[PDB]
């Protein structure tokens, strides 16, 4: 039959969440950043945003086909109806999930914590970010856990602008002695129409138009046209 609108919306949200979790677990190593689900008559297009699209596709597309089939089998879409693209992020430096994955696989590669964090920070700043903050917590040195914070630029924390001016990601790193937690926050620059950042300005920012230089008429001149 059919279900209520409330249940339908909750259900498609649940589907999106599970799909994103599975795609994360599958393509974290390939710079996975997110999934977009587009429903069109008799078709469902799944766009996977990743930094390394060729690794996501695999050789001759094999990997992507596998993924499609797996989705087809899991969520019970009719055979041949679901399909999966794969695109690249516009700016990797401004995606906190991508930077968190980069830091994760840097730490998994034996790189020292401070070197990796400072490199990620500098790459984010060089990408045009207004500011960023990277926190790594856990057994960094010895048996006692500690936290380690790296900040640069401007970073807001309160109010509604935090929901569209700063992008946040939290990730786990499985090391020999235990889990390291990494948190990456990027404060996006104000972008008027062009997606490097939000279109709306910060609510407390007031810009005053510079008055043009006029010359006061000394005498009444009448111009006939």
């Amino acid at each position: 039959v059919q279900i209520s609108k409330k249940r339908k919306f909750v259900a498609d949200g649940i589907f999106k969440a599970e799909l994103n979790e599975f795609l994360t677990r599958e393509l974290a190593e390939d710079g996975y950043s997110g999934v977009e689900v587009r429903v069109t008559p008799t078709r469902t297009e799944i766009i996977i945003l990743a930094t390394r699209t060729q690794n996501v596709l695999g050789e001759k597309g094999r990997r992507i086909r596998e993924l499609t089939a797996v989705v087809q089998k899991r969520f019970g879409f009719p055979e041949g109806s679901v399909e999966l693209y794969a695109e690249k992020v516009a700016t990797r430096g401004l995606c906190a999930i991508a930077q968190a994955e980069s830091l994760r696989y840097k730490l998994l590669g034996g790189l020292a914590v401070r070197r990796a964090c400072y490199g990620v920070l500098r790459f984010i700043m060089e990408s045009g970010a207004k500011g960023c903050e990277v926190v790594v917590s856990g057994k960094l040195r010895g048996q006692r856990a500690k936290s380690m914070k790296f900040v640069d630029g401007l970073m807001i924390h309160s109010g509604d602008p935090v929901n569209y001016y700063v992008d946040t990601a939290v990730r786990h790193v499985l090391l020999r002695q235990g889990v390291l937690g990494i948190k990456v926050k990027i404060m996006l620059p104000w972008d008027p129409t062009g997606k490097i950042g939000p279109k709306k300005p910060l609510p407390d920012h007031v810009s005053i138009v510079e008055p043009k230089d006029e010359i006061l008429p000394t005498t009444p001149i009448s111009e006939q046209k």
Binding site: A112, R114, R115, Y118, R141, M148
Partner: peptide, 25 residues
Amino acid sequence: CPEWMDDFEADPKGKYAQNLLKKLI
């Protein structure tokens, strides 16, 4: 080396502080 500055800044007073300071100069 930047790695020396990092390892020193992590523990400015530690088992490896003197060696890293000597390396920095």
